């Protein structure tokens, strides 16, 4: 359901005229986040309300773009990915494995499972630790 909270969830400044009777009983606003990211038809014809969905919310995707492997999906509307990389120790002339767990928001227009490869884009600080936004999910 959509109205599961104390306030009325809505798209701000988007107004559906009650005296005007149309087919689609709501008026939904959606954009495309650029950079060749196909906006999903579930976000076009969905019913959720999300301030931080990069296709429907007031959040721009800009600057850096990362890809990662999802690790945990237990909190509401945010996941945690794990980027892995090889650091180079010039003394021993060889490498070592490291990792950084970057938490990242996920729109309700996406279905992630623990183990797939997602593509995230940097947005303005959503929360204390969430600066990225999931924009293209891929299976594994």
């Amino acid at each position: 359901t959509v109205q599961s909270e104390r306030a009325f969830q809505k798209q701000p400044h988007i107004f559906n005229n009650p005296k005007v009777k149309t087919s689609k009983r709501t008026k939904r606003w959606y954009k495309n986040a650029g950079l060749g990211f196909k906006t999903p038809k579930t976000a076009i014809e969905g019913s959720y309300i999300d301030k931080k969905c990069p296709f429907t919310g007031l959040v721009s995707i800009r600057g850096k773009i990362l890809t990662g492997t999802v690790v945990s999906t237990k909190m509401h509307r945010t996941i945690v990915i794990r980027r892995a990389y090889l650091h180079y120790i010039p003394k021993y002339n060889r490498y070592e494995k490291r990792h950084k767990n970057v938490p990242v928001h996920v729109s309700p227009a996406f279905r992630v499972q623990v183990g797939d490869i997602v593509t995230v884009g940097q947005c303005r600080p959503i929360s204390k630790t969430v600066r990225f936004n999931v924009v293209k999910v891929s299976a594994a």
């Binding site: 109205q3 909270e5 104390r6 306030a7 009325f8 809505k10 107004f15 559906n16 005229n17 009650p18 005296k19 204390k128 630790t129």
Partner: protein, 177 residues
């Protein structure tokens, strides 16, 4: 007193960050203006840049807009009914954003009479309005959502609650009573 830096919180990993500097002026906070309902009384705060910012301590009237008719009238705010953050604000009659107040309805029904040639209660397709809105007109107060930030601009401007929001907040009021 208030400051809003992020150097006094725990780390993301769950560590305690030691202090890095004294508190700075560009991360100040100020004391909330618990704006209540009374005669108009408004402070002016000087803000970064030289910019004025009006705080409201008590404000009676307000500007409320009927969205379905696209008009706006100045009405008198009666009292706060619902507020999704704190029923203590509901109790103490605090005027903030997203509050649900009851307003006077006489200027709206006067405009309706002078515009559609028809009274309320008791061009016909244009004259037809919603049933709950007609019930509120018969009652004498209208439900309206405040959409201004009266601790920042000092204005209480809102819009009259239209169909879907009125249904949701009517369910909320009746369930919470």
């Amino acid at each position: 007193g208030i400051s809003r830096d992020s150097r006094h919180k725990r780390s993301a990993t769950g560590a305690k960050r030691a202090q890095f500097r004294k508190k700075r002026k560009f991360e100040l906070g100020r004391q909330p203006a618990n704006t209540k309902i009374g005669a108009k009384r408004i402070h002016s705060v000087r803000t970064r840049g030289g910019n004025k910012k009006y705080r409201a301590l008590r404000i009676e009237t307000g500007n409320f807009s009927w969205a379905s008719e696209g008009i706006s009238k100045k009405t008198r705010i009666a009292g706060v009914v619902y507020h999704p953050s704190n029923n203590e604000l509901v109790r103490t009659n605090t005027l903030t954003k997203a509050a649900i107040v009851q307003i006077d309805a006489t200027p709206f029904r006067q405009w309706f009479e002078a515009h559609y040639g028809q009274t309320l209660g008791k061009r016909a397709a244009s004259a037809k309005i919603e049933s709950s809105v007609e019930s509120q007109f018969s009652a004498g107060r209208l439900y309206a959502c405040i959409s201004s930030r009266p601790g920042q601009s000092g204005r209480c401007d809102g819009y009259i609650l239209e169909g879907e929001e009125l249904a949701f907040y009517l369910r909320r009021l009746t369930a919470k009573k």
